[PDB]
Amino acid sequence: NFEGYVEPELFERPGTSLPNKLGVMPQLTWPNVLNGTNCEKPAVPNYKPPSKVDVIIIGAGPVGLTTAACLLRQGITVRILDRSPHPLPVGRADGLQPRSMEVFDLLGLGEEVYHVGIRVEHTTVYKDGKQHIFAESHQAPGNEAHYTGLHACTQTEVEHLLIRDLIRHDILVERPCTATSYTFDEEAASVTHPITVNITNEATGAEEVVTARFLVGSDGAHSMIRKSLPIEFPGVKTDLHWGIVDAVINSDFPHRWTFGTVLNSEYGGCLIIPRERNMVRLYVQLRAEPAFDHSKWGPEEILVILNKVFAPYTLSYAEPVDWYTILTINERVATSFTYKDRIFLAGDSCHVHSAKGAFGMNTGVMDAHNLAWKLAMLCRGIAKPSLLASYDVERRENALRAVATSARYLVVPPGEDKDVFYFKKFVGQVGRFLIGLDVDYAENALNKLSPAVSRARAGYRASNPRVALSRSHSGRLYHSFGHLGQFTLLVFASNMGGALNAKLHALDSYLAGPSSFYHAYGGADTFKIVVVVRATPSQADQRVKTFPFLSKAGHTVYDDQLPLSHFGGDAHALYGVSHEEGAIVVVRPDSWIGTSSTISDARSLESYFDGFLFKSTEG
Amino acid sequence: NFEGYVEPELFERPGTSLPNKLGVMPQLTWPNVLNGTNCEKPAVPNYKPPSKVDVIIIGAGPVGLTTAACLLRQGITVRILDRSPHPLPVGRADGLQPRSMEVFDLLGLGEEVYHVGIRVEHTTVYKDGKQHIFAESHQAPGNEAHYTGLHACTQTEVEHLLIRDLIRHDILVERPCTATSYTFDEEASVTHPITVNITNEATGAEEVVTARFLVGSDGAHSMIRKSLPIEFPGVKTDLHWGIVDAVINSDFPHRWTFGTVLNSEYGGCLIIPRERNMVRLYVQLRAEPGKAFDHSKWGPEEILVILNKVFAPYTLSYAEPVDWYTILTINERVATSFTYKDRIFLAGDSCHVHSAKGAFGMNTGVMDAHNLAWKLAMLCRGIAKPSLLASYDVERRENALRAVATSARYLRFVGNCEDKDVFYFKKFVGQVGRFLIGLDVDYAENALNKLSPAVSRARAGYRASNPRVALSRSHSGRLYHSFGHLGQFTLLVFASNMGGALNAKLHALDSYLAGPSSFYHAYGGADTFKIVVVVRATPSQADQRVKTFPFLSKAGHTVYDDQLPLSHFGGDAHALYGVSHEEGAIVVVRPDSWIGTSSTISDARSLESYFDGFLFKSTEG
Ligand SMILES: Cc1cc2nc3c(=O)[nH]c(=O)nc-3n(C[C@H](O)[C@H](O)[C@H](O)COP(=O)(O)OP(=O)(O)OC[C@H]3O[C@@H](n4cnc5c(N)ncnc54)[C@H](O)[C@@H]3O)c2cc1C
Ligand SMILES: Cc1cc2nc3c(=O)[nH]c(=O)nc-3n(C[C@H](O)[C@H](O)[C@H](O)COP(=O)(O)OP(=O)(O)OC[C@H]3O[C@@H](n4cnc5c(N)ncnc54)[C@H](O)[C@@H]3O)c2cc1C
């Protein structure tokens, strides 16, 4: 006894971008599926969110939505709202770095961001009509990374998939609902919910107050929550300007379309970004003088200056403009990202960078990811103040790093071009940071450097080599990690023979005891044991069975890859583990290395966990 | 009470390919890990292979190894031999099509073939120094397919990853062992009517093995094919390709992008990008007038002079010693039959040989092996009627006959030679460019493929669509992820939102299937089928309704068809398979992921005679 299915109602939203001589593209959308509460038949039926919530989220852009989704995966009750009546129809951010892709894949959303748009794996450089560079680029090593290159997947499409994931968890974005004010009882231990937020529905007029444990401010560049705190938002209004267009553009450019840069020392530079559906996005330098004037800079105006930059190649529109705008470059970074461990900024509320870098969605999503697993452990009370302090530190300084490299985006060998040689050297110094594999967290309570392995480094990306999860399934070591509420204890065990056998038996006895760090901080509620055995699956299952605690609570994985070279790379060599001493690597929930230890030193982790965690016991 | 871990002995095997002025690269290997029984201590300790196995495999090239790997998933007992003392050090095939990627992914080996080498997603075409074409190519659409483009993954890497997968299953390739002779008692009923006579050519020890079935993956000069009254026709063009893998420097504006460089005077060149900054260049070499072709005349250095004539005015020069070099003579042949009395089966180059240029050999070979192995497994289980191994023969032979035809069309212009050369290539790409990436592997009707109008798009004998779906509230993946294992058909029960008209029909089907005489139970139950209920609703809405059908929730697996409506921002499984929300559908998906048939929810009885067309009745447990 259920109603039949009805196909969702298409609406072709018109385009708000300035047109060209062909028009502005409309944008396909489905308001009932995508507009949250602001619709006639909501994708979640009879959605009745509570008045008391663990986390309230102001802002339902890419960063708020990611935060919503990571929390919902940990069982944290959540409400989220956004002032706009519908998600972004087109434009703004347009692609993801390899490391952003890794994040979605760890959340179970890898298929939604992969193979949406095109893939960028090459770069070109031209100067004054003459090709200088065409090369493979944006690469990650296959024996350490699944994803490589940049991936076109726009902000619209990211909002779509994240809204659909919230729906799958029976959560809707409340639109179009503004958070007008909020209170924080800084003074009151007895209280659980010292936050109240007044919400006003700009469609219907109804007000509301929610009480919440924690508040996440992800409301963009002009954040009211940031403005309400003793936080400053310093930066430099460069007053340099980009004209940006997204469209299908016919050209005789030999490399249509390839990521890269077209330099004219005469007329300034152009940046090419290939797009889905035979489109290209073109950034172009914009300078005006006889004060910067927005009035005479339309889509057709910049195509005229574009043809001057690509001489002798010429560009002509083949269809109506998909997107278009002028951007002012202002880079800003909040002095702090936390406040009293109750109000938390993430995304454009914390930092604003030039669009050119493409950091906002990428750095934003990685902010939400860093925040959400720490904030979630705060909701079940095992998080010491240090843990959420590491959020502010780790992501603020990464925001500062993004600011330095965007500034310098802008001594030569004799037979060499001055502006192209500083490009190859730029690509060399920051290339891996531009793809996310070199996001670098300095030492803190969570990142404890250790010489126990020669290569895996605290505060740095965990390496993702190929391993066998079973006899039949040969995938990636990331696939064995725990969920967002657990730390992954990588226990490298060699082939569990030689010297290490005794040490592993010791290790087994330490861990089973109720005073072990595993048991001391919650057992399987906060840890996932992975035993990495460099042996055949039959030799390993045999041997793992002699270790009663390891067999009974560990998940064995088979490190059966060929030795490190251009034909292989096992986890032991790629993490830098000694076959005599073993290792216990602590991978944080977000995939970054936390610390490491030898099998003998497994007791050193009691101190390491005490730095940011309170003791806990499994359920 | 276990010995400590010893790191594998590395050996740099010298190259046997002719050098350039800088030499010939050695090739990294690890004899104790990769050479099977023929090493000092094997990677499977005390491999004691039985003298009586279900299936014995002759040849451990990509095809034989793939066949072993599929059978070992199924619990078939297997012995696999190869005359050669080690696997391929370098060269021959260098890449996989998107559809071969899907085949590895279904076997659980997708991560071993992805991100091994480079990826080809673009084509260029030059003629007489002027560029004519530079575009995205080899695309598959993302709302239907995970992989797209060409993936560089060599025969060497493929053999590596398949040998390692056999080690995980405690199987070693028996090297360097030759099947000298074999007997097949057609007289008698015995379980094991095949005996194979084996000589190790290292130690001279002979041995006899008894098998239920024999697989001839022994290559182009298959001894097994010759023993059988099976013909191997085709034409030997004595057209010649010069092939060279090397790091090559060039001022070519597109170095290196897949494509073709034409020169009117000097013929043509095919480009293939490779890992580690190499490139593969095919170039035509033509025999002088009257005289036969003289291999003696063409080394790496000579080939490079022809390449610089073909690429004028851009020049090429070696930066490193040659990684690989050979002269292939194109000779395309197909066996008149691929099976023999459903006891000896051919797969790979023993069945068909192609122009390397087309890169058919390894991709079709893996797909043959895939096709063969699941049918052969049901034959070992007993449930296979002869009609099914018949479908192996005609599916793969016909596909081989198709593959020959498209390169016969390609190779006429290239040997011969608004621009009419580039025009014929654009049309050629538009016509076969998706069979060339494998999505148009197209099986004609037979017992296994019955066309059915119950759905608008899914089609018997064609590739099952792979749209995005949610497998849980937090895991949004692909529909292939729900499919059964290699000895199961996937019963894709499209159920709409389980509401309206269909609620009644689906309640009937629930009680139909639960009976011991429904097609599900009659042909094996969970031993032959997996049910997937594809609900176009939200997860908790779907979970609730599914609870109201007791057999479907008891025995089916719910996936959530929650993408946006089919467009450029989405595509639900219901729309991409062509299901009507009034009728529903039971799309039957074969083990290899080709569509078998479909019916409406009310026509569930129609599948009964479908499965009797090629299966014996079975009972779970
Ligand atoms: C015009 C423009 C162009 C851009 N171009 C690029 C680009 O080319 N490349 C790139 O990488 N990045 C670009 N960005 C940045 C990118 O859009 C953001 O970095 C990314 O969306 C992350 O921002 P966010 O999710 O934190 O918030 P945003 O998406 O900026 O906005 C957060 C949301 O909060 C809501 N909100 C604000 N105040 C309230 C309130 N009081 N109550 C309720 N809801 C509220 C807003 O409605 C908004 O939807 C651009 C941004 C803008 C504005
Ligand atoms: C020179 C050359 C170049 C090629 N180039 C390309 C290319 O560019 N692209 C492409 O896609 N394909 C190419 N191929 C084809 C590719 O090598 C084959 O398609 C692929 O190996 C599949 O063949 P197969 O596994 O069936 O047999 P193969 O790998 O060719 O050989 C089968 C195996 O059987 C073994 N064997 C033979 N007889 C016996 C016996 N009596 N007892 C035991 N073992 C035996 C052999 O030693 C060998 O290991 C090339 C092949 C060759 C020979």
Please check whether residue A512 touches B, CB under 8 A.
no
A199 within 8 A of A56, measured Cβ to Cβ:
no
Cβ-in-10-Å burial (0-12, 13-18, 19+) of B329 comes to middle
Angle between helical axes of B155-168 and B360-381 (0-180°, round to 10): 20
Task: Return the residue matching tokens 């992800």.
Answer: A218
Superfamily of domain B26-116+150-232+335-432: FAD/NAD(P)-binding domain (3.50.50.60)
Query: Nearest to residue B117, comparing CAs of A563, A462, A122, A143?
Result: A143
Query: Nearest to residue A52, comparing CAs of A191, A148, A157, A186?
Result: A191
The token pair at B466 is 């792979």
Q: What is the DSSP string of A375-407?
A: HHHHHTT-B-HHHHHHHHHHHHHHHHHHHHHHH
Sheet holding A119-120, edge to edge: A95-96, A150-152, A119-120
Please check whether residue A495 touches B, CB under 8 A.
yes
- Residues 6 or more apart in contact with residue B413 via CB below 8 angstroms: B421, B424
CB contact under 8 A, A536 and B170: yes
In DSSP terms, A15 is beta-bridged to none
Query: Nearest to residue A582, comparing CAs of A480, A452, A455, A476?
Result: A452
Other Cβ atoms closer than 10 A to B103: 24
In DSSP terms, B124 is beta-bridged to B134, B259
- Residues 6 or more apart in contact with residue B56 via CB below 8 angstroms: B78, B79, B80, B81, B194, B196, B209, B211, B213, B214, B215
In DSSP terms, A281 is beta-bridged to A246, A273
Distance CA A209, CA A197 (A): 5
φ/ψ of A502, rounded to 5, equals: -55, -50
Distance CA A315, CA A310 (A): 8
Helices (H), B143-260: 155-168, 223-227
- If one residue of B175, B218, B245 were mutated to test the ligand 2 pocket, choosing by the most ligand atoms within 8 A of its CB, it would be B218
CA torsion angle A291 A296 A300 A303 (round to 10): -20
| Cis peptide, bond prior to residue A230, ω within 30 of zero | no
Torsion sign over Cα B278, B282, B288, B294: positive
Distance CA B529, CA B271 (A): 45
φ/ψ of A435, rounded to 5, equals: -100, -5
The token pair at A223 is 């954040």
- Specify the fold of B468-612: Glutaredoxin (3.40.30)
- Residues 6 or more apart in contact with residue A290 via CB below 8 angstroms: none
Distance of CA A327 to the CA centre of its chain: 23
Q: Name the maximum alpha-carbon separation found in chain A.
A: 83
Write the residue in B108, B119, B148 that is nearest to A121 by C-beta: B119
CA angle A486, A491, A492 (to 5 degrees): 145
φ/ψ of B469, rounded to 5, equals: -150, 165
Query: Nearest to residue A567, comparing CAs of B246, B158, B165, B111?
Result: B158
Q: Are strands B122-127 and B259-263 parallel, antiparallel or unpaired?
A: parallel
B350 within 8 A of B220, measured Cβ to Cβ:
yes
In DSSP terms, B207 is beta-bridged to B198
Query: Nearest to residue B183, comparing CAs of B210, B207, B205?
Result: B210
- Specify the fold of A237-331: D-Amino Acid Oxidase; Chain A, domain 2 (3.30.9)
Q: Which amino acid is at A539?
A: Q
A488 within 8 A of A456, measured Cβ to Cβ:
no
CA of B468 to the centre of ligand 2 (A): 37
Q: Which amino acid is at B357?
A: K
What SS3 class is residue B325?
strand
Residue B254 distance to chain A (closest CA, Å): 7
What SS3 class is residue B350?
helix
Q: Are strands B344-346 and B206-216 parallel, antiparallel or unpaired?
A: parallel
Task: Return the residue matching tokens 């509401």.
Answer: B499
What are the CA-CA distances from residue B212 to residues B60, B339, B379, B400 (Å)? 19, 14, 10, 27
Distance CA B286, CA B297 (A): 11
In DSSP terms, B58 is beta-bridged to B81, B216
Cβ-in-10-Å burial (0-12, 13-18, 19+) of A415 comes to exposed
Q: Residue A58: CB within 6 Å of ligand 1?
A: yes
Please check whether residue B564 touches A, CB under 8 A.
yes
Residue A539 distance to chain B (closest CA, Å): 9
Query: Nearest to residue A279, comparing CAs of A423, A117, A389, A436?
Result: A117
In DSSP terms, B468 is beta-bridged to B478
- Residues 6 or more apart in contact with residue B159 via CB below 8 angstroms: B60, B61, B62, B65, B87, B88
A217 within 8 A of A260, measured Cβ to Cβ:
no
In DSSP terms, B183 is beta-bridged to B195
Residue numbers after which chain B breaks, C to N beyond 2.5 angstroms: 188, 417
Distance CA B10, CA B27 (A): 10
The token pair at B292 is 């036969």
Distance CA A324, CA A222 (A): 22
In the stretch 278-307 of chain B, residues with CB closer than 8 A to chain A read none
CA of B158 to the centre of ligand 1 (A): 46
B467 within 8 A of B534, measured Cβ to Cβ:
no
| Ligand 2 atom nearest to B347, measured from its CA | 26
Distance CA A250, CA A314 (A): 8
Other Cβ atoms closer than 10 A to A46: 6
Q: Residue A594: CB within 6 Å of ligand 1?
A: no
Q: Which amino acid is at B107?
A: L
List the resolution, Å: 2.4
Q: Which residues of A touch B110 (CB under 8 A)?
A: 475
CB contact under 8 A, A536 and B43: yes
Query: Nearest to residue B238, comparing CAs of B331, B303, B326?
Result: B331
Q: Which residues of A touch B107 (CB under 8 A)?
A: 472
| Cis peptide, bond prior to residue A257, ω within 30 of zero | yes
Distance of CA B39 to the CA centre of its chain: 29
In the stretch 371-400 of chain A, residues with CB closer than 8 A to chain B read none
B217 within 8 A of B58, measured Cβ to Cβ:
yes
The token pair at B294 is 């003289």
Distance CA B129, CA B313 (A): 6
A216 within 8 A of A56, measured Cβ to Cβ:
yes
Q: Name the maximum alpha-carbon separation found in chain B.
A: 81
CA angle A534, A536, A540 (to 5 degrees): 75
CB contact under 8 A, A563 and B499: no
The token pair at A146 is 């699944």
Q: Which residues of A touch B569 (CB under 8 A)?
A: 28, 156-157, 160
The token pair at A492 is 């490298």
Distance CA A402, CA A394 (A): 13
| Ligand 1 atom nearest to A358, measured from its CA | 11
A375 within 8 A of A55, measured Cβ to Cβ:
yes
E-state strands within A65-168? 78-81, 95-96, 119-120, 122-127, 130-136, 150-152
CB contact under 8 A, A501 and B2: yes
Query: Nearest to residue B351, comparing CAs of B235, B232, B234?
Result: B232
Distance CA A326, CA A513 (A): 63
Query: Nearest to residue A325, comparing CAs of A222, A242, A238, A237?
Result: A242
Write the residue in A8, A107, A565 that is nearest to B565 by C-beta: A8
CB contact under 8 A, B109 and A169: no
- If one residue of A216, A219, A349 were mutated to test the ligand 1 pocket, choosing by the most ligand atoms within 8 A of its CB, it would be A219
φ/ψ of B175, rounded to 5, equals: -120, 155
Write the residue in A2, A111, A136 that is nearest to B468 by C-beta: A111
Tally of residues, chain A: 619
B88 within 8 A of B81, measured Cβ to Cβ:
no
Q: Which amino acid is at B515?
A: G
| Cis peptide, bond prior to residue B30, ω within 30 of zero | no
Please check whether residue A119 touches B, CB under 8 A.
yes
Please check whether residue B573 touches A, CB under 8 A.
no
Distance CA A604, CA A601 (A): 6
CB contact under 8 A, A30 and B562: no
A532 within 8 A of A559, measured Cβ to Cβ:
yes
Q: Which amino acid is at B525?
A: G
Other Cβ atoms closer than 10 A to B522: 19
Residue A484 distance to chain B (closest CA, Å): 12
CA angle B192, B79, B203 (to 5 degrees): 110
Angle between helical axes of B62-73 and B155-168 (0-180°, round to 10): 30
In DSSP terms, A182 is beta-bridged to A197
The token pair at B236 is 């030997």
Residue A503 distance to chain B (closest CA, Å): 13
B579: alpha, beta or left? (left if phi > 0; alpha if psi -120 to 50): beta
Helices (H), strands (E): how many in chain B?
16, 30
CB contact under 8 A, B170 and A558: no
- Selected for mutation to probe chain B from A1, A2, A102 (highest B CB count within 10 Å) is A2
- Residues 6 or more apart in contact with residue A16 via CB below 8 angstroms: A24, A89
A133 within 8 A of A124, measured Cβ to Cβ:
yes
Distance CA B246, CA B324 (A): 7
Distance CA A339, CA A228 (A): 11
Distance CA B164, CA B314 (A): 43
> CATH 3.50.50.60: does it fit domain A48-121+146-233+332-400?
yes
Distance CA B508, CA B496 (A): 15
Nearest ligand (C-alpha, residue A66): 1
The token pair at A526 is 């906060």
CB contact under 8 A, A168 and B134: no
Q: What is the DSSP string of A148-209?
A: -SEEE--HHHHHHHHHHHHHHTT--EETTEEEEEEEE-S-----S--EEEEEEETTT--EEE
Query: Nearest to residue A354, comparing CAs of A309, A405, A305, A306?
Result: A405
In DSSP terms, B133 is beta-bridged to B125
B358 within 8 A of B406, measured Cβ to Cβ:
yes
Nearest CA to ligand 1 atom 18: A360
Query: Nearest to residue B147, comparing CAs of B183, B106, B199?
Result: B106
Asked if B26-116+150-232+335-432 and B468-612 have one fold, the answer is no
| Interface size between A and B, measured as CB pairs under 8 A | 198
**SS3 per-residue string spanning A472-512:** CCEEEHHHHCCCCCCEEEEEECCCCCCCHHHHHHHHHHHHH
Q: What is the DSSP string of A290-323?
A: -----TT--HHHHHHHHHHHSTTS-EEE-S-BSE
CB contact under 8 A, A562 and B255: no
The conformation of residue A48, written as its DSSP 8-state character, comes to -
Torsion sign over Cα B197, B200, B206, B211: negative
Query: Nearest to residue A259, comparing CAs of A155, A390, A170, A126?
Result: A126
Other Cβ atoms closer than 10 A to A207: 10
B533 within 8 A of B559, measured Cβ to Cβ:
yes
The conformation of residue B526, written as its DSSP 8-state character, comes to G
What SS3 class is residue A596?
strand
B176 within 8 A of B83, measured Cβ to Cβ:
yes
Experimental method: X-ray
Distance CA B287, CA B292 (A): 6
- If one residue of A66, A155, A182, A406 were mutated to test the ligand 1 pocket, choosing by the most ligand atoms within 8 A of its CB, it would be A155
Q: Which residues of B touch A167 (CB under 8 A)?
A: 538, 562
CA angle A281, A286, A291 (to 5 degrees): 145
**Cα first-last separation, chain B:** 39
CB contact under 8 A, A5 and B496: yes
Instruction: Delimit the domains of chain B by residue range.
Output: 26-116+150-232+335-432, 468-612
In DSSP terms, B560 is beta-bridged to B470, B535
Distance CA A55, CA A110 (A): 25
What SS3 class is residue A530?
strand
Architecture in CATH of A466-610: 3-Layer(aba) Sandwich (3.40)
Nearest ligand (C-alpha, residue B346): 2
B25 within 8 A of B323, measured Cβ to Cβ:
yes
- Residues 6 or more apart in contact with residue A560 via CB below 8 angstroms: A467, A468, A474, A534, A535, A536, A537, A570, B164, B167, B168
Task: Return the residue matching tokens 């259920």.
Answer: A2
A318 within 8 A of A21, measured Cβ to Cβ:
no
Distance CA B578, CA B559 (A): 17
CB contact under 8 A, A474 and B165: yes
**Cα first-last separation, chain A:** 39
Q: Residue B176: CB within 6 Å of ligand 2?
A: no
